[PDB]
Amino acid sequence: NVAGVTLPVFEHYHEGTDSYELTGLARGGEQLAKLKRNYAKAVELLVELA
Amino acid sequence: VCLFLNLANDPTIERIITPRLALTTAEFLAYQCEKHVLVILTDMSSYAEALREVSAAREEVPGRRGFPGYMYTDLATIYERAGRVEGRNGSITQIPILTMPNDDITHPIPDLTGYITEGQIYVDRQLHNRQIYPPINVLPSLSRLMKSAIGEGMTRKDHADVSNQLYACYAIGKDVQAMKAVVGEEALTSDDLLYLEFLQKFEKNFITQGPYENRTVYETLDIGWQLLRIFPKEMLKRIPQSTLSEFYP
Helix, strand or coil, X not given: CCCCCCCXXXXXXXXXXXXXXCCCCCCCHHHHHHHHHHHHHHHXXXXXXX | CCCCCCCCCCCHHHHHHHHHHHXXXXXXHHHHCCXXXXXXXXXXXXXXXXXXXXXXXXXXXXXXXXXXXXXXXHHHHHCCCCCCCCCCCCEEXXXXXXXXXXXXXXXXXXXXXXXXXXXXXXXXXXXXXXXXXXXXXXXXXXXXXXXXXXXXXXXCCCHHHHHXXXXXXXXXXXXXXXXXXXXXXXXXXXXXXXXXXXXXXXXXXHHCCCCCCCCCHHHHHHHHHHHHCCCCHHHCCCCCHHHHHHHCC
């Protein structure tokens, strides 16, 4: 409530379910962890813009 | 002190006669004898009522609001008995009081009085309801001869600057209270808090005097400086730098 009227905003609430071990496709675990991190940053930025 | 009283139940002719008697004794005591005299008149609206009475007795046709037209020149006669005169070291100064009917500035009495006076001091109902013993509202008030009444040879050099700054920042403070009325306290800046606190302390101290506190002019200027020191140095836009260096620290 920044003024007389109330504005809608959102928060990146990390619910925290465990990720998925994908150890089948030659097991590039480094690549998967890096991808997860990058997309997490993307999601946070997108939530902020939203 | 030379005092005159005229109760309400007295003859009206006594009422019309009295102020001229007061003015003549003032003139004698001030000019024929070297004195400086402060004349105070109370509630000239009753003098106007007596003027209406004598007009009705003579059977002259009333005009605006039941007042004779020549009352303007009559009031001029009761005025213009002031100012200094060459060849004399004395002075005379009139400070009358009026009863405004229903807060109407366009009523003939105050309007004409303003046409033949050099300023006015207001009294506001809200301040009286706020239990501030001097209810003076200094915003609409104005004195036309400030520039010569004060100065370095006078009370002090910094007086005019202090007065102007005080007036301007009070205006801004009233505006900031209006701002707070809607925007909320959390949406304010530090500057707005400074203005509000300054305003509050100002009516607390500068305006309130007490029924017997005889403050000297230097004391009033000191109080003003103390209140000014609340704001930081840079916001004193109306203050020349030299005075700020001399007095602010």
